[PDB]
RNA sequence: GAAGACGGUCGAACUUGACUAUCUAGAGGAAGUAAAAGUCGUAACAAGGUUUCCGUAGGUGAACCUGCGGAAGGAUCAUUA
């Protein structure tokens, strides 16, 4: 299987396409993990560091997240099988990088970590601005600027 | 001595701009209370495993942590030339 990057658009010819995201449920009750297997390839296909899309699930779900250089596992704590992610797999696009003028997420970020500001720019119609101040992930991005 | 006309004086109503009082519709946003077999933790109650609480300021998935100055409603009404 393969998919469009976002399912709010039903078009077969939509500009954005990527591999599936698949995960393992591991352990037993009071200590369950969900580990995301494709995360480095999905982060490469979306042109972002793999910390940002992993951190967004913990911000929405109300859950802990882990990262590890010794084992390369990316983890969201608790059981999040099937619909518990797959109803909202669009979200890292749908709550950040859709343009309000047109539904075309051909979109870039630049971080000014010395001055508490994240700049945003979409190629599709020239839409520019910043990320939202009520939204969760802004406090993580300013402490973790892009490569 | 009839119709009619100039001038005053009451003043309904009409046009135009502004102010204002009630009721009423709405993209989208952000909160509160019912219900008690959803999810991730374990902040408070026994020294609750870092005593707790107040004012103010900064910081984070969340409960919350840290700096400065107070309170006991404390876990001491007491410590010896």
Hey, CA dihedral for A37, A95, A118, A80, is it positive or negative?
A: negative
- The residues facing A109 across adjacent strands are A120
DSSP 8-state assignment for residue A95? T
**How far, in Å, is the CA of A31 from the C1' of nucleotide B75?**
36
**How far, in Å, is the CA of A115 from the C1' of nucleotide B20?**
48
Give the method used.
cryo-EM
To one decimal, the resolution in angstroms is 2.9
| Cα–Cα distance, A92 to A114 (Å, whole number) | 25
Measured CA to C1', what is the nucleotide nearest A58?
A: B61
| Cα–Cα distance, A40 to A53 (Å, whole number) | 10
Both tokens of A128, joined, read 């520019």
**How far, in Å, is the CA of A103 from the C1' of nucleotide B58?**
39
Q: Which of A44, A40, A32 is nearest to A71 (CA)?
A: A40
């Amino acid at each position: 299987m393969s998919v469009n990057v976002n399912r709010s658009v039903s078009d077969q010819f939509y500009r954005y396409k990527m591999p599936r995201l698949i995960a393992k449920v591991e352990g037993k009750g009071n200590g369950i993990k969900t580990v995301i297997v494709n995360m480095v390839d999905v982060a490469k296909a979306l042109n972002r560091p793999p910390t940002y899309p992993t951190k967004y699930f913990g911000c929405e779900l109300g859950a802990q997240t882990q990262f590890d250089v010794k084992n390369d596992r990316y983890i969201v704590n608790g059981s999040h099988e099937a619909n518990k992610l797959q109803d909202m797999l669009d979200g890292f696009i749908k709550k950040f990088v859709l343009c309000p003028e047109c539904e075309n997420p051909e979109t870039d970020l630049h971080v000014n970590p010395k001055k508490q500001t994240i700049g945003n720019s979409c190629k599709a119609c020239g839409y520019r601005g910043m990320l939202d101040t009520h939204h969760k992930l802004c406090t993580f991005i300013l402490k973790n600027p892009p490569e």
